[PDB]
Amino acid sequence: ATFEIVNRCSYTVWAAASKGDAALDAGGRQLNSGESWTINVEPGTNGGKIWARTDCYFDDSGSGICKTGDCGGLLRCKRFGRPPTTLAEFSLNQYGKDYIDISNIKGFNVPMNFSPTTRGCRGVRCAADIVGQCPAKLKAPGGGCNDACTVFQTSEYCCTTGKCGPTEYSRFFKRLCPDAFSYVLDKPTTVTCPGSSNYRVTFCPTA
Template sequence: MQPGTKQARIWPRTKCNFDGSGRGKCETGDCGGLLECKAFGQPPNTLAEYALNQFGKKDFFDISLVDGFNVPMEFSPTSNGFSRGIKCTADINGQCPNQLKAPGGCHNPCTVFKTDEYCCNSGKCGPTNLSRFFKDRCRDAYSYPKDDPTSTFTCPEGTNYRVIFCP
């Protein structure tokens, strides 16, 4: 990760099958049928998001469930004396509300219902019963698009990080 990287994301893909030319499909997190992603993954997928060396010489990082959930994740600083990482390790797929269930994962309500209440398109929204399903199980993770106060974490610039799928 290069300093100054803005709006980057890492996500797991599951049940993938690719041919020798790098074409195929994944059950979750698919990137338009390509082995080497050129666009964001298809929901549902758990996201690690980061922006390095941004405002006030800080790195910003989070785990987001705004695109749903497919596998547990941990995102941790590994240098500069910081060790408090964030994680989402709950059994969200097993407990997923019926209306959000998807093959291999659990959709976020915005993906399913596409309403302003869940997607925050007007810029104003708050937690809903369905977003609370995610927040109750993963306190550190974004559960809806405006969940900044409890879901964005910072470290000084130059910190190293580790993302672990299925910790």
């Protein structure tokens, strides 16, 4: 499957793509404002994620640091990034279908549209100004808006026991982005697409 990753933000973003234990394609790349990066994801990939990192500094070997979404200091991510990270999530060719979603469960750093470029399903979007409106306790110094589990590490926010309800914090994310998961037991906003579809992730889709 092919993913075109487009940076429409006015600032440079460092895109990342990983399935948790391995990079997808090159795993990461600098995208200046307007740049597009096309990657190939192997069919059958379960649990892949794409996200943006902000305010990164890397050296030659591709080592450094980002203020949001750092994946252990690497340009080419092998693991997932450090919150806050708006997340595009996908599992491909699962019994003939593809499943996509956008998640705020790990917080929010960059607005994002996640849409197919082929037929038979809708896209999803979280493009509200969550950082600007972020409740005081969730604001991350490096930028972005943390989820409540990252900040407070309680069983309720993290849904450790498998039973948990919405919270004042999760409702904040849900109210600004109804099409994104706001906590782990949220009513699913997953979109079902035909198997072997192709997609575009756009950072800052409106502004």
